[PDB]
Amino acid sequence: LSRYEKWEKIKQHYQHWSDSLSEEGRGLLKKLQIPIEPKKDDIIHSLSQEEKELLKRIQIDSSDFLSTEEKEFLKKLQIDIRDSSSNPLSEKEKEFLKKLKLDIQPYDINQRLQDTGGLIDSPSINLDVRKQYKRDIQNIDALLHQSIGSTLYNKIYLYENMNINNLTATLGADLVDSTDNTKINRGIFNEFKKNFKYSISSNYMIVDINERPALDNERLKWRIQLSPDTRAGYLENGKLILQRNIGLEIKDVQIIKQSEKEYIRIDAKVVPKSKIDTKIQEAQLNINQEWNKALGLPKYTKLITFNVHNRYASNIVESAYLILNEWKNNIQSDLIKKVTNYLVDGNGRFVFTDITLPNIAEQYTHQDEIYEQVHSKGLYVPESRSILLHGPSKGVELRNDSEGFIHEFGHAVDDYAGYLLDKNQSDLVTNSKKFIDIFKEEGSNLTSYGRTNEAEFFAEAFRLMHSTDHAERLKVQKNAPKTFQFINDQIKFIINSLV
Ligand SMILES: Cc1cc(S(=O)(=O)N(Cc2ccc([N+](=O)[O-])cc2)[C@H](C)C(=O)NO)ccc1F
Numbered sequence: 001l002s003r004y005e006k007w008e009k010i011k012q013h014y015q016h017w018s019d020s021l022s023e024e025g026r027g028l029l030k031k032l033q034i035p036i037e038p039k040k041d042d043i044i045h046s047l048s049q050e051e052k053e054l055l056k057r058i059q060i061d062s063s064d065f066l067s068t069e070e071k072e073f074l075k076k077l078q079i080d081i082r083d084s085s086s087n088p089l090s091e092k093e094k095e096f097l098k099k100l101k102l103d104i105q106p107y108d109i110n111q112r113l114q115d116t117g118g119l120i121d122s123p124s125i126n127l128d129v130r131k132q133y134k135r136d137i138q139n140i141d142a143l144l145h146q147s148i149g150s151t152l153y154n155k156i157y158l159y160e161n162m163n164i165n166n167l168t169a170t171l172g173a174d175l176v177d178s179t180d181n182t183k184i185n186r187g188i189f190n191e192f193k194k195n196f197k198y199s200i201s202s203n204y205m206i207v208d209i210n211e212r213p214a215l216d217n218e219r220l221k222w223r224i225q226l227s228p229d230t231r232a233g234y235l236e237n238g239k240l241i242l243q244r245n246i247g248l249e250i251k252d253v254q255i256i257k258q259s260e261k262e263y264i265r266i267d268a269k270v271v272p273k274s275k276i277d278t279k280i281q282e283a284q285l286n287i288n289q290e291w292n293k294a295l296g297l298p299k300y301t302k303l304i305t306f307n308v309h310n311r312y313a314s315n316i317v318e319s320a321y322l323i324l325n326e327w328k329n330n331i332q333s334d335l336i337k338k339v340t341n342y343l344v345d346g347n348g349r350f351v352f353t354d355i356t357l358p359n360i361a362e363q364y365t366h367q368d369e370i371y372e373q374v375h376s377k378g379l380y381v382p383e384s385r386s387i388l389l390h391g392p393s394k395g396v397e398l399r400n401d402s403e404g405f406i407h408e409f410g411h412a413v414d415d416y417a418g419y420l421l422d423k424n425q426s427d428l429v430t431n432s433k434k435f436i437d438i439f440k441e442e443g444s445n446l447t448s449y450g451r452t453n454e455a456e457f458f459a460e461a462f463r464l465m466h467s468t469d470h471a472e473r474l475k476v477q478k479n480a481p482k483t484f485q486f487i488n489d490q491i492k493f494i495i496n497s498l499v
């Protein structure tokens with residue numbers, strides 16, 4: 001092989017292609033590798049001084065609609081204004097921040113592709129910028145026309161280092177052994193691997209020709225074999241950019257040692273994306289048939305959607321089975337059937353996805369304003385009667401995804417309770433005067449996040465009331481007894497409704 005010969009051999013295979021790039025095609029490939037960050041300068045100059053002042057004083061971490069990267073850029077903003085315990089955010093703070101959110105995003109082509117799963121017409125960004133992305137993406141596709149071919153494809157491996165958290169933030173938090181960081185927690189490793197059979201790249205993978213030693217937080221070391229018709233381009237310093245929309249079969253996942261630290265080897269083979277989409281679609285059919293039976297729904301009913309497009313694809317699929325099983329185990333059968341039938345009556349969905357929730361139609365078709373769209377671990381959208389669950393991310397103070405689902409189902413229970421109460425004036429039961437008063441009293445007795453408003457308080461209480469941990473079910477009865485009773489009352493009220 002030889003690392004250096006391999007490199008020169010691949011470079012030569014693409015030499016005509018490289019020499020052919022215009023300065024425009026060249027600038028585009030660099031824009032793809034290096035996103036154009038927002039200039040913190042311009043940002044602050046566009047604010048009024050009352051907003052400069054307002055921004056400085058906000059508890060940024062107490063936002064439920066901002067990601068970590070976003071929260072961090074705003075603290076770096078907060079401080080540069082200034083160089084010249086967890087109370088719920090105010091109304092005028094939230095409105096301000098929701099709009100500021102739209103002005104601090106990088107122009108990041110690979111990120112736009114990952115967040116949308118390639119559905120780049122999703123109205124989750126400004127239409128002018130949306131077309132820019134599309135122009136760049138179409139141009140890059142056209143550049144990437146030369147396949148790796150029949151000679152090189154089975155004679156080379158390509159490599160990618162990855163952060164575990166890019167696939168699953170929930171497992172990533174505890175994949176490195178806590179008492180020794182050079183070691184992989186064997187139990188977590190078995191779970192990460194058990195349902196990792198295929199993977200989709202909806203963006204342009206940038207891969208190394210020769211394996212590169214891990215940097216900070218790169219415990220995943222992919223080794224990838226291309227197919228002869230995989231299209232790619234040479235990039236300087238020993239790299240290849242691969243075409244978007246490819247499928248990978250996971251051939252082997254192993255713990256391995258490199259320089260006295262432990263790493264996860266992921267061996268993968270490029271296959272046609274369509275082959276993997278067929279597996280996904282088949283599993284969607286399967287899980288709907290299983291759960292239409294269990295719920296006494298017509299067999300052709302479409303209730304569960306796999307909206308799946310990214311690198312941990314197969315786990316998002318297997319995970320939905322578990323999530324729904326825990327849901328079934330910890331919630332009364334009749335409550336489940338009554339509420340789910342209500343959601344089916346409104347064409348609702350359980351959406352399990354690895355794209356960001358603003359790019360889910362059950363959210364965006366009812367939320368025209370981007371400053372009102374939300375990304376998070378989970379969501380209930382009453383206008384479309386759907387529960388949305390984002391696989392890859394980790395919910396704030398959430399053990400697992402099963403608990404997150406139960407919380408969202410809590411929002412659905414609120415919806416249906418208030419509907420039954422007044423079917424002509426459909427409102428949320430937590431908007432009722434009785435519950436409002438309960439909230440002003442007990443509202444601070446459960447989780448910190450339960451303080452936000454009536455709806456979340458209800459959903460947290462509901463979730464805690466159905467925990468597998470008996471201690472938690474009891475802390476609600478003890479610390480929030482009117483809420484406890486109010487909810488069990490809603491539950492009886494729903495279960496006793498007609499057919
Ligand atoms: C605990 C919990 C969280 C979530 S969440 O996805 O993280 N989540 C709430 C949340 C809570 C706390 C923070 N925060 O930045 O502190 C951010 C977001 C969303 C907004 C929600 O309530 N959807 O219904 C979902 C369910 C759930 F049970």
Ligand SMILES: [Zn+2]
Pocket residue numbers: 407408411456459
């Ligand atoms: Zn909620």
